[PDB]
Design a protein around this ligand. Sequence first.
Ligand SMILES: O=c1ccn([C@@H]2O[C@H](COP(=O)(O)OP(=O)(O)O)[C@@H](O)[C@H]2O)c(=O)[nH]1
Ligand SMILES: [Cl-]
Ligand SMILES: [Mn+2]
Ligand SMILES: [Mn+2]
Ligand SMILES: [Mn+2]
Length: 553
Amino acid sequence: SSMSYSWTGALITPCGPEEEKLPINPLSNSLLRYHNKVYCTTSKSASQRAKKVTFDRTQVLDAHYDSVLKDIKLAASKVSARLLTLQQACQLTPPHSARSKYGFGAKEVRSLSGRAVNHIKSVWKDLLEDPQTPIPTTIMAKNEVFCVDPAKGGKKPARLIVYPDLGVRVCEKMALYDITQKLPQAVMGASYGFQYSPAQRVEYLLKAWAEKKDPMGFSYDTRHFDSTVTERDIRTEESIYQACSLPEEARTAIHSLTERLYVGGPMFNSKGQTCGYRRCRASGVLTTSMGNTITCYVKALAACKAAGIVAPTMLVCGDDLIVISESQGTEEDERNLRAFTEAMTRYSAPPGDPPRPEYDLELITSCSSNVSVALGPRGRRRYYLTRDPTTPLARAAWETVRHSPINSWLGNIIQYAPTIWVRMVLMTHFFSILMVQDTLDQNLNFEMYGSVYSVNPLDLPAIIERLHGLDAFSMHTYSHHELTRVASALRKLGAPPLRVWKSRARAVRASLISRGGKAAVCGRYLFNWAVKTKLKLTPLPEARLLDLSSWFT
RNA sequence: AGG
Ligand SMILES: O=c1ccn([C@@H]2O[C@H](COP(=O)(O)OP(=O)(O)O)[C@@H](O)[C@H]2O)c(=O)[nH]1
Ligand SMILES: [Cl-]
Ligand SMILES: [Mn+2]
Ligand SMILES: [Mn+2]
Ligand SMILES: [Mn+2]
């Protein structure tokens, strides 16, 4: 039926200059040695990505699909959502959001300058009046950092980001922001993945596992999800949005956004040239996450019914899903999974890697992470979320004129505080660097799910107890998989091995302790693993006084 | 670029 994209031959050009690595990396050259392996995806590579994501979709739905979709609309009809005022929408614009072509930027939008507010008024009037003329978009490469992988063909090409003008982005929020905050949870309940912290994700997966008499689990992820989303999927997304209780003016803007923007349109490069035409998800529109997650969930639940998955418990985040179900024996399990994949494939959600049944929770990877297990202070099993540290280590070494890696270190330390790789490697390095800089008590930004949080390094013990529990400071006897994977990632990036990190950690610990105050608490709590004569760690008062519920919702 |  439809091609995901068509191209004119015009290049996908960069915005600014693409920052160069330097001959010395003063903050990370004591973390690892193989700086040659750390690269950032470039705009040049964007044309290789374009080739990989351009293909003809044919989609074939069926009664399982139709029935799931009906149930979802019903669930959506229990939501009432409102328009945001123009002003509220303006003030949700992030501070460095790309500026408008019409001579204003995010600062103006957030301050509600008159020229900006006035332009946005007309953009919106035009949405209400013209339900048809396609809205132009800019296409850009995403620049992100990875470690080279010779197995997977050296360097990944940059993903494609497609977005409309700042004025339109503000209007999308007026129309849809309140739905983004309510609909997913309304139609998916506990299956909606972005509502859980790492420990809560873990707790949910364990409950689900223990509920089954004989559990089986698998993960799924779609190859190039955005390019696989069809015109019809997007219109079906609208009908899910329209099932909510909305004021008429929202309805009208939603429909017009759908027809003029979401279902497709022309793409221009940064130099202003026509680049191509799109007939799939623009990753960059406000509905990217909600849309991906709801469309993934519809296809996936229908595919579970098509395949005969029994008592499925799902967890979905964008195109990433886990299903924990009742095993029907391994022969049937395997065939049910092939049936799952075939249905998803008819639904236009083909797999990156064919999924596979598993019967041990450690072997299931979704959203680049997996549950693992270690022993606590009293010898009890303690489960936690971990991941391959390769990419976090590479990002820990991205250091240029424009970019400091310290914030990346902090983000990982917080999300993955119970992991052996955070505790032994990233914590040791982070604290050593900040001590020597004498910047321990300076606040840092921490990025997650598009939001920034300011954190003081000296509050890490409290934050960690709160997010992960006091046992995050006392885990030992990590698993074979985790020990093997961490040792291997360290060798691969030319980092010191764990025993070296241990002797560094002793020195970092002693030095923090000798400063007293909050620093010494960091020393005692964060590095208790580093000394033979363990200390008794008690709950921290400062931790009871904390609420972190917005960080992971 | 969005969440
Ligand atoms: O920086 C990102 C990463 C992902 N996505 C969205 O989430 C989807 C799933 O991404 P995944 O990481 O599974 O890779 P893909 O499936 O795109 O190859 C993408 O297609 C995008 O629509 C996005 O909008 N921006
Ligand atoms: Cl314990
Ligand atoms: Mn994918
Ligand atoms: Mn409509
Ligand atoms: Mn994915």
